Amino acid sequence: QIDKNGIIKSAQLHDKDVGSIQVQVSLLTSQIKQLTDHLLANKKDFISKRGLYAKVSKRKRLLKYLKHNDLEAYRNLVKTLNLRG
Amino acid sequence: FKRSKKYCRFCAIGQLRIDLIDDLEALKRFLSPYAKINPRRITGNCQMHQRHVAKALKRARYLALVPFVKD
């Protein structure tokens, strides 16, 4: 499993902030990487594929919201995460 | 006649964890005279403890601690 504490402490905009959109999408990207690794390894686990698709869609919706509101933070988040491509 | 003394022993003990090398003689009571897992009506445990006991007893039977078909 991933070090959620480390990911949150890296992605926090300030202290005690553990549920912002930026920390949520950073956690989502980490889980996306882990699930892509697992799915490429296995290739016949379809529940994991469903979970991966759900997480991808949730990340996309969160990024759409963060682009609609406070777009400068969206540019910041995208250039730190390099998730677009 | 019959009896109403059927209660989950592990519920009263509050054992909360089953290990096959801590109450080995306890599981032999649950096992049938022909080495089968007795149902709830005879065994007396609740569903959670019955499931735990069944898994532990099957693990022991794999480990060759109690037979399969004979006494």
């Binding site: - | 022909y34 009506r41 004979k70 006494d71």
Partner: protein, 59 residues
């Protein structure tokens, strides 16, 4: 399914062997003809329901 005669009497041995043979014959006849998985599940549930209702009315 060993039952000891105990050499004290014989009718007792047959009285227990009748049961042991009955619950043995149940599974012996169950594993005789091939039914689908769903039909086998239906038969198991039907037997369980019959036993449950009999015990409810006898208790």
């Amino acid at each position: 399914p060993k039952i000891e005669v105990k050499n004290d009497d014989l009718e007792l041995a047959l009285k227990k062997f009748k049961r042991v043979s009955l619950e043995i014959r149940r599974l012996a006849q169950r594993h005789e003809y091939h039914l689908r998985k769903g039909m086998r599940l239906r038969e198991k549930r039907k037997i369980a329901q019959k036993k449950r209702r009999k015990f409810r009315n006898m208790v």
